[PDB]
Ligand binder design. Structure first.
Ligand SMILES: COC(=O)c1ccc2ncccc2c1
Lengths: 172, 171
C-alpha cells in the first residue's frame, strides 16, 4: 500500500484515525478519549464533529496536515470488493490485512450492539489473535482499496468476532 | 513472542526458524559463495536438501529466544495455509492459500515439484498487496491445528497470473 496512505494513519486514544485531507480526520467513536476538550492544539469550539454510531469525522477550521492532498471517502464499498485494513504493529511493522467485504449488518459482538459493513479476512483460517487477525488496539484503522488509477477510503475498523473470521467497518 | 520474528532475510529471499538450531529455506535463494551463515562456519552446519526445500541444523543455539515448532511434510489436501510474506518496506502480508496435491508443474518455463496451492485473494493483486513476487521465495507455509502452529514448507514458485503457487516440502 502506498507510503502516502500509511502517513495518514495516526495513533489516537485507544486506537487509530485517518487523515482524509489537511482538515478532515476520521476514527472509530469508542477509541476517542471521553473527557477530551482539545485536539491537535485546537479547542472543541473550533472543530465540527459529525457522529454516526461508531463512525466519527472531525473537520478542523485550520490545516493540521498541510503535507496532505484531499482523497475520496465513500460510504462503504460494493459487495465483493477486496479491501486492505492499514494496521500498524509494535516496531514499524505494517500489516495491510486483506478482507472481502459483504453487506451492511447489525450484529452483537462481545455483548455490544454493532452496525456497519461486514467482511471476512483473507489471511488464514481460525485467524484469532495478532499474527493473522485483528486485536482491540486496531480499532480506527482505515479500510482502503484501489480503483482504475486511484485509492479510496470507505470506513474505519470497529469490531471483530471471537473466531476472528468476521470484521465490521463503521461507515459514513 | 511472534511467528513473524522467525521470518528472516536470507540470500535472494527469506527463511524461517523452526527452533533455536533449525532454519528452513528455498534451495534456489541460498548463496553459492559462502564460508559462514549467521556467524557460524559452514564446516559446523548440517545441510539437508530435497529439491527446492533445504534445512540447516546449526551446532550452537542461534535463536535461543524461540521454542521448537511442529514441522511436517506438506499438509492434508484442502487445508487453508497462510504464506507469511515479509517485504523490504516493513510490510507483513499473510495470504490465505487452499492447498492441493503434490505435483510437478511448469511455472514460466521451469519444472517445479512440491505441494500445489491456489491463492484465495481473487482476481489479480490489481496493484494491491494480494499476491506474491519473485523476492518472496523462502517464506513459510503455516496453519493453526488445535492449539499448535504447524509449518509445512517454503514458497518455491508462482505462476505469471499469480493464483497457482508451489510450497516445497521435506523428504
Ligand atoms: C476450502 O475452501 C474452499 O472450498 C474454496 C473456497 C474458495 C476458493 N476460491 C478459489 C479457489 C479455491 C477455493 C476453495
Amino acid at each position: 500500500a502506498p507510503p502516502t496512505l500509511w502517513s495518514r494513519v495516526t495513533k489516537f486514544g485507544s486506537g487509530w484515525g485517518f487523515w482524509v485531507s489537511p482538515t478532515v480526520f476520521i476514527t472509530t467513536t469508542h477509541v476517542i478519549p471521553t473527557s477530551a476538550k482539545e485536539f491537535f492544539g485546537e479547542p472543541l469550539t473550533s472543530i465540527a464533529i459529525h457522529r454516526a454510531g461508531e463512525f466519527t469525522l472531525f473537520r478542523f477550521s485550520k490545516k493540521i496536515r498541510p503535507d496532505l492532498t484531499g482523497m475520496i471517502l465513500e460510504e462503504g464499498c460494493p459487495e465483493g470488493t477486496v479491501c486492505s485494513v492499514l494496521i500498524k504493529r509494535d516496531s514499524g511493522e505494517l500489516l495491510p490485512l486483506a478482507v472481502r467485504m459483504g453487506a451492511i449488518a447489525s450484529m452483537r459482538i462481545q455483548g455490544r450492539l454493532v452496525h456497519g459493513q461486514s467482511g471476512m479476512l483473507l489471511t488464514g483460517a481460525n485467524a484469532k489473535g495478532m499474527d493473522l487477525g485483528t486485536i482491540p488496539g486496531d480499532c480506527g484503522a482505515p479500510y482502503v482499496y484501489k480503483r482504475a488509477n486511484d485509492w479510496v477510503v470507505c470506513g474505519v475498523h470497529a469490531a471483530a468476532t471471537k473466531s476472528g473470521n468476521t470484521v465490521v467497518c463503521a461507515v459514513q
